[PDB]
Amino acid sequence: MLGLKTSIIGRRVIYFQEITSTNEFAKTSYLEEGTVIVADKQTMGHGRLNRKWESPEGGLWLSIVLSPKVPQKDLPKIVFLGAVGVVETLKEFSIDGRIKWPNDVLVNYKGIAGVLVEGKGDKIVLGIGLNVNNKVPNGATSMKLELGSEVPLLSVFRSLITNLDRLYLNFLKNPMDILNLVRDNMILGVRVKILGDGSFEGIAEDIDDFGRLIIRLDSGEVKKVIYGDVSLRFL
């Protein structure tokens, strides 16, 4: 009854009034490629770095099951697919979102969406958490706060699924393309600090052909940061 016209993503959609986490369900269940798992709220949701994710009623919490048969050297790039999809959808609602490497989406430096990609055996689970009408934590934002008005949650879903499907079909044929879209929508040319072990600061110059963040330290040294399991702070 939803009348989705997508080719792969959204061929099937499993909706839950409440769930522990859409990513966990997608990982532990056999689902055909393109299946979207979505819930009004999550009781154990989280984003990258295991950051607890308040997923209250009003937001868009979903996961997509994918099994892209692309060269493995290109597989690591699906994380960006979600971020770019969110940016395209936000633009449709007159909101200018920018990507905070690797896959967070910000609006005026305030978090509005997060992407969590996990791999289980043969498939990849692309999780997205987008603040729409739900109340957000201090420092974060939402579509409702940005537009100062209620936003039809289903309208956002339709838009996002449509964009993700389009991006995914092209990724299957031209996997290098997504990096260019990421680059064109990412926050660059500003100072950042990579936290944790061997912490350092520098200018985030660009992302390379592998999606690594290229940082220029004050000394002139150039470091390439892997998208995995690191935290980044804007200075």
Instruction: Give residues in contact with a second copy (CB under 8 A).
Output: 1-6, 10-17, 38-40, 57, 60-62, 153-154, 156-157
Whole-number minimum distance, CB 154 to a second copy, in Å?
Answer: 6
What Å distances lie between residue 14 and 114, 141, 181, 232, CA to CA? Answer: 21, 27, 29, 34
CB environment 55-64: b (16+ within 10 A), e (fewer): beebbbbbbb
Select from 29, 27, 3, 7 the least CA-distant residue to 127: 27
* Closer by beta carbon to a second copy, 124 or else 156: 156
* Cα 144 to Cα 142: distance, rounded to the nearest angstrom: 5
Whole-number minimum distance, CB 22 to a second copy, in Å?
Answer: 11
* Closer by beta carbon to a second copy, 134 or else 185: 134
DSSP output for 100-160: ETTTEEEETTEEEEEEEEEEETTEEEEEEEE-SSS---TT---HHHHHTS---HHHHHHHH
* Closer by beta carbon to a second copy, 12 or else 193: 12
Whole-number minimum distance, CB 158 to a second copy, in Å?
Answer: 9
What Å distances lie between residue 46 and 69, 115, 180, CA to CA? Answer: 27, 10, 28
